[PDB]
Fold this sequence. Notes:
- The structure is a homodimer.
- Chain A is built from nine helices and two strands, in the order αααββαααααα.
- Chain A is mainly alpha-helical.
- Chain A has a single domain (6-223), classed as Orthogonal Bundle (Retinoid X Receptor), CATH 1.10.565.10.
- A two-stranded antiparallel sheet of chain A has the order 1-2.
- The radius of gyration of chain A is 18 Å and the shape is globular.
- At the A-B interface, α7 and α8 of A face α7 and α8 of B.
- Bound molecules: the ligand */C(=C/C(=O)N(C)C)CNCCOc1ccc(Oc2c(-c3ccc(O)cc3)sc3cc(O)ccc23)cc1 (2 copies).
- Residues 38-39, 41-43, 45, 79-80, 82-83, 96, 113, 116, 199, 202-203, 206, 208 of chain B line the site of one ligand 2I9.
- Chain B: Residues 1-217 are annotated as: Interaction with AKAP13.
Amino acid sequence: ALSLTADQMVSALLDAEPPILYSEYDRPFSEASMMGLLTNLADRELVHMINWAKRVPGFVDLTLHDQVHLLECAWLEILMIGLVWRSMEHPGKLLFAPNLLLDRNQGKSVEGMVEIFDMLLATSSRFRMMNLQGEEFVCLKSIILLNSGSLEEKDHIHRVLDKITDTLIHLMAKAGLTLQQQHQRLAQLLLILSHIRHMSNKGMEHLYSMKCPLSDLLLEMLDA
Amino acid sequence: SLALSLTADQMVSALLDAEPPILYSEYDPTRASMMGLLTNLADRELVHMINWAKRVPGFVDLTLHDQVHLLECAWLEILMIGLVWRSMEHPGKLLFAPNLLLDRNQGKSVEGMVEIFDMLLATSSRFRMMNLQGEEFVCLKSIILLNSGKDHIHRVLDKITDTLIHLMAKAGLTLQQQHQRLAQLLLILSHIRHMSNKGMEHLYSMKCLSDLLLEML
Lengths: 224, 217
Ligand SMILES: */C(=C/C(=O)N(C)C)CNCCOc1ccc(Oc2c(-c3ccc(O)cc3)sc3cc(O)ccc23)cc1
Ligand SMILES: */C(=C/C(=O)N(C)C)CNCCOc1ccc(Oc2c(-c3ccc(O)cc3)sc3cc(O)ccc23)cc1
C-alpha cells in the first residue's frame, strides 16, 4: 500500500467506490417515517462502506480493533461527504438517494434537522464552486476514514495519509495547476474536512436526542 | 487591500506581534471549584483574544456582524490550540496557566472532562512530535479564526497558506515535505474542531459574550 504510485492509489480508490443505493419505496413524510427511511438507507449503505474501507490502501494492515474504531469515529462523516458529493448538481436539495431528493423544507419534518441540513447544502455548494473532482473526492473520503480516530499503527496511518496527500498534489499538478495553486487547493480541501467533522458532531448529537448496534455489524463484517 | 498585499514575512511578523499574553490563574490559596478557576481564566483570556483577532490581517475588513460570528464560533477552538501549544513541553499535563498545570489525574476531578482532556494531551504530543514552530502556530490559530463555523475570507486563507509554505521552504523542507507537513497541520485542525464541539457539549451541561464582542469590535 505504501508502495503504490499516485496513479495506482487513484485507481484503487475509484474501483473501491461503493454503489449509489436507493431509498425504500415506503405521502408527505412524518418525523418517524423520514427517520425510518434515512435510518434504513444509512444501515444498508454502512455494509457497503465496510467493504469500501477494507479496500482503502493500508486499512486492513491495522489491527482489527483499530479498523473498528476508525469506522466507529468516521461513519457519519463518510455518509455526509458522500451525500454532499451526490448533491452537488442539485442546488437547494440534498440527494440522499436518486428516489429521495429532499429540499430544506422537507428537513423541517424532523425537529432539529433543518439547521444541519443547511450546513450540508452549504457544503455541497462549496464543493460545486471549487469544482471538486471525483478523484479528489475519493482522496478526501479516504482521509476522513484514516484521520478521524499502538504508536506503530498511528505511524502507519500517517504514512498512508502522506501518500494520499502526495496523490492529491499529483492530481492537481497533472491537471496543470501551478505549485502555488496546488498548495492553496490542497489547503482549501482539507479545511472543508473541519466543516464535515463539525456537521458530523452536530448530526451525532441530533441523532442521540431521538429514539433509535453498529458495533455488531462492524465486527461481523470486519472479521468476515 | 493592504492585508492582501502582505508578504509571508509581514504576515508572520504581524501575527507574532498580535500574540496575547499567557495569563495566570487567580491566586486564592485557601479556596470541585476547578471549573471556577478555568471559567475565570477563560473569561479574561477572551478579552485578549478579541484584541488579537483585530490584528489578524484582513479580519477588520469584514462587517461587524461577520467578525462577531467568526469569534463566537472559533473562541473555544482558539482557547484550546493555545492550551496545547503551551502544554507541548509538559508531556502528560495541560498547562492551562503557569500556576494551573494539571495531569490526567487532576482532570478526572471534573466530571465529563477526562475524555476531552486525553484528546487535548494527544494533540499536544502530536504537536510536540511534529516540532510545531511558533510561527506555524500563529498561522494555524489565524486559520481557525477565519475557517470557523465571503470571497475575502478565502483570499486571506490563501495568503496564510502561502505563508505556511514559505516558512517550510525557508526551513529547508523539500517541496514534497512542504505539502505533507501542510496537510498534517490542517488535518489536526479537524481534531481541534472535534475537541471544540465536544467541549461545547460538556460545557453546556453545566450552568454558568455577544455583548462583549460587540463592545470591543
Ligand atoms: C440508532 C441509534 C443512534 O443513532 N445512536 C446515535 C445510538 C439509529 N441508527 C444510527 C443511524 O441512524 C441514522 C438515521 C438517519 C441518517 O440520515 C443521514 C444524515 C443526517 C443524520 C442526522 C442529521 O441531523 C442530518 C443528516 S446524512 C446522511 C447520508 C446518507 O448517505 C444516508 C443517510 C444520512 C443517518 C444515520
Ligand atoms: C456561560 C455559559 C457557557 O457557555 N459555558 C461554556 C460555561 C459562561 N461561559 C464562559 C466560558 O466558560 C469556560 C469554562 C472553562 C473552560 O475550560 C477550558 C478548556 C476546556 C473546557 C471544557 C472541556 O470539556 C475541555 C477543556 S480548554 C481551555 C483553554 C484556556 O486557555 C482557558 C480555559 C480552558 C473554557 C470556557
